[PDB]
Design a protein around this nucleic acid. Structure first.
Lengths: 151, 149, 141, 129, 262
RNA sequence: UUAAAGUUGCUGCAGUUAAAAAGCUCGUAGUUGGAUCUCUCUCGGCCGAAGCGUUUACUUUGAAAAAAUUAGAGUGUUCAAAGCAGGCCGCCUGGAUACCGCAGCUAGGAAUAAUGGAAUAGGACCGCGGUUCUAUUUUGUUG
RNA sequence: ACGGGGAAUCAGGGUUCGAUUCCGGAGAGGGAGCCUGAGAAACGGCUACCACAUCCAAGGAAGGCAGCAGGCGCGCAAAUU
């Protein structure tokens, strides 16, 4: 199974899949009810999370994470390691002896959910703060906006 | 001044204040476009079409007559080529300088001019790739260049 | 000329950092080689033991004999030459005496006719040379 | 290349009035140039001027009345808060009785006193006295 | 530190206590209690420093251990007890009742009340929840847990508590047009009517308050204490009535007083 | 060690001969970059609650910013440095106020500076039709 | 090089200092490990090792002033058992 590529069976803990109802229910269709939440700060849940079948517990809409803290924005730089991406934030720092600025940047690793498909490394992503998900990951992608070369 | 030369020449064209077609030119916009299509099928670049029209038919400017530019007309009809003409002529000169350079290994000055020409090629290629005219993976190969020309 | 942009602070600060090292006062203070070569080690005064009485002949056009003393420093074992300031004040110093020694006015530079001497005597055996010279105190017995 | 066309506009006017001339040509024209010139004119420093259209960046002919000591630009356009204006006018103006600093604020291009009346800061364009 | 702290330095004490520099190195560290350390007035600084019934800290203990002071109806023998906003202090020997109300300068005032007014207090609502077997529970700014309240009372409201029984007698909701006092920040001690409340989800709300003289200010929603319904307060007010005078107005009002004297 | 030092120069220095422009050109990062364009749909009793206007930089405002120190108000320590006291014949009265870069939060302005909005038209706005999933109001209730 | 609040200098910009009584951190000769307790990897608690050092009948026992005084040492450099 594509959904079952790991050594342990993957399921949404809130969902019970063994409701013995009737032979007709077996005959009719086997599609699990899915748990999705409304991560809400004006954000909308993508429809690929309500209709998807992926199993990932660090997703905000269909996983066990809470979004609180800071809302930030960045530009996608690298998509290489499994299920997480590296983004860049560019800012100006003020040096007051010369009354001038200098460009500085930060590289920040965020978690990317499967509900956000067809994303390339040029585009603006909004991120929300959550609990520590790994050693160097504390943010999670909440919205994807295409870059200047929008099709 | 010049990009790759120390010259500072001033010669150019001076458009008149009149943006209006004169009364003695009786060619309609559609008839002016017909000559553009006709000369586009004889392997004429837009800049060649412009001088032909100017010298022969009394067409000072086609933006002033038909309200459009020659390359836009050709692209709307589908007669624009793959590479832009300015980048096409720069690659043609690079092949000629490089072809002279295998029979002449001690020609140290053509080796300088080829570097200048390919720098100009890279500048135009960068500009066109930022404009989504060339595909992002386009790259000028010093050996494969003849395939483009 | 110099760059004058709004995003030039890094350039300006790095250039100033690099060019400050061409100031010899700044380099001397901030490099650390002039602190290791200083016999006093950054102190204004130091104590030492008298090894020998020396006489240093003055630089031209002056012709005289400046009366100094060779002193070994207690805290590090280094050896210096110290000038005995006033008239006849060398008669108060004896060998193997402990003396207090100070700088001689120019922050490690020689002063006047006296060649290569950077230090001067202040006290001998816990008695100031001024008190001995003016007859306020005498050498302990 | 030509950057900060207003610098060229203000250097041309300063250089001509040193020679005692009665008219100066400024090219190219720009709306920042026009607003700066209007600010200078309403205080009695230049006088009437006129814009020539070229179907391009036009040009300006300015009449000179011999009342200008200096007009200059400040580059770059430093941001000025209403609490930092006194230092700027001490550094740039020759006296507390005459001279003007020209700023651009969200209420328009003005001088340092109209900005104080309107209680607003901005970015410094230049000065004239 | 390996554990909790038990001392307070005099320069680190809350400024509204008005403690001088040269009396000692230490200040009374308030005991743990219903009010916070930085938002309370300990009993020693009220009996000794404000009312001057005692000259030293040993005399405060002699007054307290005679069981003369009641804080909201109960005798407290702790001399660093953290009394706070809206509390009622009763000294029966001299027949005095006081309410802890901020003045316009941000300091607790010596506000004497009548024996009838000392029978109740106003309490903000901090938390509402449901406990075992479905019983509603309140938690107030006084750390009072009151169960079976009205279902119309919500967070940020005000209730009236009868100190003898500890039960709710009335309440005021939070809405525009209601009187309030500021209990923190830069407008502490000011009284005015709520005019607007701008909501910032995921962050702190902001409430706009207008005085009786027409001056408007804003505060965070956590610094607002609803006093009365409309323009009428539910408790007696201090001398300044919550209006903040400017320094020039205060100077003129002070100079006019000494000319009157003669 | 600070000023003097406009002898480290952002304000604000020098490089023909006093110390000093790379032998010359290309070229990535960095820095800089020519004209140009004059707020509204649902609800609670004529206003508010809710959407943003492309996004910013900038400017003004607001609240949030330990005390001590510094600036500063009052006060004859006998004057003063200090202190936070004191004054009237039981009463009266203070223990103010300002400042607190950068970053984060908030609300007005829209000049200056970046940025996007239709060109295989997969464009805007209007009415029209079809395919699929689906709202659980209506059959006094329940299927 | 403990970090801030801050200090000196000062036309404007700036330069230098902040071990030091207020806030936060760290340590108790150097490493490490624990018991009790709400809280300690505690040292005016314990257990080892490393370095010093104390009494002894030679079998054994007991140590930790960067707490207040005070002494030695180190120094140009700092107070009453």
């Amino acid at each position: 199974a594509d959904i079952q590529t790991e050594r342990a069976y993957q399921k949404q803990p809130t969902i019970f899949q063994n409701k013995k109802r009737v032979l007709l229910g077996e005959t009719g269709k086997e599609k699990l009810p899915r748990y999705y939440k409304n991560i809400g700060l004006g954000f909308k849940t993508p429809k690929e999370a309500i209709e998807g079948t992926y199993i990932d517990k660090k997703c905000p809409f269909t996983g066990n994470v809470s979004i609180r803290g800071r809302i930030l924005s960045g530009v996608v730089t690298k998509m290489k390691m499994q299920r997480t991406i590296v983004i860049r934030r560019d800012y100006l720092h003020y040096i007051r002896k010369y009354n001038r600025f200098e460009k500085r940047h930060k590289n920040m690793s965020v978690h990317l959910s499967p509900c956000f498909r067809d994303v390339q490394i040029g585009d603006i992503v909004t991120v929300g703060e959550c609990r520590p998900l790994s050693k160097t990951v504390r943010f999670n992608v909440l919205k994807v906006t295409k870059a200047a070369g929008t099709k | 001044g010049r990009m790759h030369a120390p010259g500072k020449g001033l010669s150019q064209s001076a458009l008149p204040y009149r943006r209006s077609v004169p009364t003695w030119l009786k060619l309609t916009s559609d008839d002016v476009k017909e000559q553009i299509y006709k000369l586009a099928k004889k392997g004429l670049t837009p800049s060649q079409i412009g001088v032909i029209l100017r010298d022969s038919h009394g067409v000072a400017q086609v933006r002033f007559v038909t309200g459009n530019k020659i390359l836009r007309i050709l692209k709307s009809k589908g007669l624009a080529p793959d590479l832009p003409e300015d980048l096409y002529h720069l690659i043609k000169k690079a092949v000629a300088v490089r072809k002279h350079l295998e029979r002449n290994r001690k020609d140290k000055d053509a080796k300088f001019r080829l570097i200048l020409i390919e720098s100009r090629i890279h500048r135009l290629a960068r500009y066109y790739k930022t404009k989504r005219v060339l595909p992002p993976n386009w790259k000028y190969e010093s050996s494969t260049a003849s395939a483009l020309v | 000329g110099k760059c004058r942009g709004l995003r030039t602070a890094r350039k300006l600060r790095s250039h100033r950092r690099d060019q400050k090292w061409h100031d010899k006062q700044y380099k001397k203070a901030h490099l650390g080689t002039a602190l290791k070569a200083n016999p006093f080690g950054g102190a204004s005064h130091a104590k030492g033991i008298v090894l020998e009485k020396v006489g240093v002949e003055a630089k031209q056009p002056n012709s005289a004999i400046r009366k100094c003393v060779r002193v070994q420093l207690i805290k590090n074992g280094k050896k210096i030459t110290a000038f005995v300031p006033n008239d006849g004040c060398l008669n108060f110093i004896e060998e193997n005496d402990e003396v207090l020694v100070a700088g001689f006015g120019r922050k490690g530079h020689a002063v006047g006719d006296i060649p290569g001497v950077r230090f001067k005597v202040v006290k001998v055996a816990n008695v100031s040379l001024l008190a001995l010279y003016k007859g306020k105190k005498e050498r302990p017995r | 290349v030509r950057m900060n066309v207003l610098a060229d506009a203000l250097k041309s006017i300063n250089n001509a009035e040193k020679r005692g001339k009665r008219q100066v040509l400024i090219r190219p024209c720009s709306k920042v140039i026009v607003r700066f010139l209007t600010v200078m004119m309403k205080h009695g420093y230049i006088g009437e001027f006129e814009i020539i259209d070229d179907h391009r960046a036009g040009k300006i002919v300015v009449n000179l009345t011999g009342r200008l000591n200096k007009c200059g630009v400040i580059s770059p356009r430093f941001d000025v808060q209403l609490k930092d204006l006194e230092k700027w006018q001490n550094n740039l103006l020759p006296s507390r009785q005459f001279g003007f600093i020209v700023l651009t604020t969200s209420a328009g291009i003005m001088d340092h006193e109209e900005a104080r009346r309107k209680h607003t800061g901005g970015k410094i364009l230049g000065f004239f006295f | 530190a390996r554990g909790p702290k038990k001392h307070l330095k005099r320069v680190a004490a809350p400024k509204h206590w008005m403690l001088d520099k040269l009396t000692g190195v230490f200040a009374p560290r308030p005991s743990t209690g219903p009010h916070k350390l930085r938002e309370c007035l300990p009993l020693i600084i009220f009996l000794r420093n404000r009312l001057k019934y005692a000259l030293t800290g040993d005399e405060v203990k002699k007054i307290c251990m005679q069981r003369f002071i009641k804080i909201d109806g109960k005798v407290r023998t702790d001399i660093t007890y953290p009394a706070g906003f809206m509390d009622v202090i009763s000294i029966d020997k001299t027949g005095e009742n006081f309410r802890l109300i901020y003045d316009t300068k941000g300091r607790f005032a010596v506000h004497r009340i009548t024996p009838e007014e000392a029978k109740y207090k106003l309490c903000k609502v901090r938390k509402i929840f449901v406990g075992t077997k479905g019983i509603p529970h309140l938690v107030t700014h006084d750390a009072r847990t009151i169960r079976y309240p009205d279902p119309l009372i919500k967070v940020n409201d005000t209730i009236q508590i009868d100190l003898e029984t500890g039960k709710i007698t009335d309440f005021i909701k939070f809405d525009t047009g209601n009187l309030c006092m500021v209990t923190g920040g830069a407008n502490l001690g000011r009284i005015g009517v709520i005019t607007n409340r701008e909501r910032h989800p995921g962050s702190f709300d902001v409430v706009h308050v207008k005085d009786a003289n027409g001056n408007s200010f804003a505060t965070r929603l956590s610094n607002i204490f609803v006093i009365g319904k409309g323009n009428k307060p539910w408790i007696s007010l201090p001398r300044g009535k919550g209006i903040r005078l400017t320094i020039a107005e205060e100077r003129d009002k002070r100079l006019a007083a000494k000319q009157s004297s003669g």
